[PDB]
Design a protein around this ligand. Structure first.
Ligand SMILES: [Zn+2]
Length: 31
């Protein structure tokens, strides 16, 4: 179960979707 971020200009892997959770929030911030 690979845990990579789905975004352009990113391409970052992790050892637990947990990090992918707080990571996807830094891709579309500015709210
Ligand atoms: Zn990312």
């Amino acid at each position: 179960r690979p845990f990579m971020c789905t975004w352009s200009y990113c391409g970052k892997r992790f050892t637990r979707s947990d990090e992918l959770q707080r990571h996807k929030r830094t891709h579309t911030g500015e709210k």
